[PDB]
């Protein structure tokens, strides 16, 4: 989509792996605020928003906290308390036609600044100080939108760039987007430290003979002693006995 028509989206309720990015592309512009890219896959978030669009070459720097310009001040501006990051990879093999591709536009003229994450589509004809030249030409009768017009002769500064901005939330978050992905082969009949879906303990595991009802996950004997557990992978019931101990 265009700069003034970014594609807002929400991505929640998923085991989110931020390492599918690195096999994609050279990642010309990749810098993260508030969280390191290396330590992303582990952390959890409230709501992850993604905005996708395309801009020119020498304006990729303008998508930053507190930076003023013409694409930042007129049609897309993100706050100073932004947490997240931006990912831009130069793309002029799929966006530039020979002669100028008048398909991508950008509001070039307007009246004032916009509030954070304020997207507008109105395409009225700009004023002329006095009662303007509505739908005609004259002194300063400039349509507000302007096409990019890419061609394969533009310098690297004028080439099209695809860019996605991810806005995270980290304060008090109800983990909805984060991945663990870490399991180990099961060991039986040996004193083993186990962590079954959060239940942590020690003991010897033995094949079970008791019928768990299908909605049950844990088993208890008298006095709340956890006696059995069902595997979250193979759904087998397992018996727990504390390994041998005593006084000498």
């Amino acid at each position: 989509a265009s700069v003034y028509a970014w594609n807002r989206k929400r991505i929640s309720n998923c085991v989110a792996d931020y390492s599918v990015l690195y096999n994609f592309a050279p990642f010309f512009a990749f810098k993260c605020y508030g969280v390191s890219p290396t330590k992303l896959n582990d952390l959890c978030f409230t709501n992850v928003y993604a905005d996708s669009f395309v801009i020119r070459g020498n304006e990729v720097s303008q998508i930053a906290p507190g930076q003023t310009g013409n694409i930042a001040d007129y049609n897309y501006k993100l706050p100073d308390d932004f947490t997240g990051c931006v990912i831009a990879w130069n793309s002029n093999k799929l966006d530039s036609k020979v002669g100028g591709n008048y398909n991508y536009r950008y509001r070039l003229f307007r009246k004032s600044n916009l509030k954070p994450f304020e997207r507008d589509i109105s395409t009225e004809i700009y004023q002329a100080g006095n009662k303007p030249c509505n739908g005609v030409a004259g002194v300063n009768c400039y349509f507000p939108l302007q096409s990019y017009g890419f061609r394969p002769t533009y310098g690297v500064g004028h080439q099209p760039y695809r860019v996605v901005v991810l806005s995270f939330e980290l304060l008090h978050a109800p983990a909805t987007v984060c991945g663990p992905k870490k399991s180990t082969n099961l060991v039986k009949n040996k004193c083993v430290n186990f962590n079954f879906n959060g239940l942590t303990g020690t003991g010897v595991l033995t094949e079970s003979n008791k019928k768990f009802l299908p909605f049950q996950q844990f088993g208890r004997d008298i006095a709340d002693t956890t006696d059995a557990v069902r595997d979250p992978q193979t759904l087998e019931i397992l018996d727990i006995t504390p390994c041998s101990f005593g006084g000498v």
Partner: antibody, heavy 118, light 108 residues
Framework: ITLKESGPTLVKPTQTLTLTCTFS??????????VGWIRQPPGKALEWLAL???????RYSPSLESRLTITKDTSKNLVVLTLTNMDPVDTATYYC???????????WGQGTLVTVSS | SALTQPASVSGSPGQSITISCTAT?????????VSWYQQYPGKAPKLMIY???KRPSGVSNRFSGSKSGNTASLTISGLQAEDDAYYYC?????????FGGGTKLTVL
């Protein structure tokens, strides 16, 4: 990727020449991909004719535009070029090559020699 | 007028040679994409190299491009008798794709 040209081999002066280029291996739906036409007089250099992008944005040669209405059909992967008012300058070979943005004309067809005379 | 290519060249078999196709015309843009085509003796030209210092997988390892400013020096090392053919250059200008005046290579 493969291309093959076809059409009338003979045409008379001031006539409407038609050519059909059928390809296989790719389509006109993925981004960046386009298909263009090229001509070559005997013993001379090549020249452009038209281009059909994947989004159905079309381009013609500046000098010889207002002609050669190039159409297409994405179901059977076929392109059609039609240029009327045949002149003896247009007696040349004709190629339909698929164009990408950096690798200009990386897949050419065979090419058919066409004559404009009695 | 748009580009410029030498008439023909004849290099003894097994040496190297570079050819220039200067534009000799202002505002062809950034002059960044420059492709070279192989014209056989009456066949459809085949792409040899594009993006001058780059080269498409599928061709030999003797051709190598360079750019001395406003031209593209297409080089051919270890000339073999198979190399007798025509060569052309191609790069869009502001309004439309343009070609070189052509070059002939006969190996003797």
């Amino acid at each position: 990727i493969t291309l093959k040209e076809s059409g009338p081999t003979l045409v008379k002066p001031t006539q409407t020449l038609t050519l059909t280029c059928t390809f296989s291996g790719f389509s006109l739906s993925t981004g960046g991909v386009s298909v263009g036409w090229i001509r070559q007089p005997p013993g001379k250099a090549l020249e452009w004719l038209a281009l059909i992008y994947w989004d159905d944005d079309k381009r013609y040669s500046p000098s010889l535009e207002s002609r050669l209405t190039i159409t297409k059909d994405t179901s059977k992967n076929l392109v059609v070029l039609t240029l009327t008012n045949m002149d003896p300058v247009d007696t040349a070979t004709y190629y339909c090559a698929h164009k990408t943005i950096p690798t200009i004309f990386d897949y050419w067809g065979q090419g058919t020699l066409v004559t404009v005379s009695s | 007028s748009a580009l410029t290519q030498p008439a023909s060249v004849s290099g003894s078999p097994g040496q190297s040679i570079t050819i220039s196709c200067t534009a000799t015309s202002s505002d062809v843009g950034a002059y960044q994409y420059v492709s070279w085509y192989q014209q056989y003796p009456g066949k459809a030209p085949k792409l040899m190299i594009y993006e001058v210092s780059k080269r498409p997988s599928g061709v030999s390892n003797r051709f190598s491009g360079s750019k001395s400013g406003n031209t593209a020096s297409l080089t051919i090392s270890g000339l073999q008798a198979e190399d007798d053919a025509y060569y052309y250059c191609n790069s869009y200008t502001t309004s439309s794709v343009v070609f070189g005046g052509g070059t002939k290579l006969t190996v003797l």
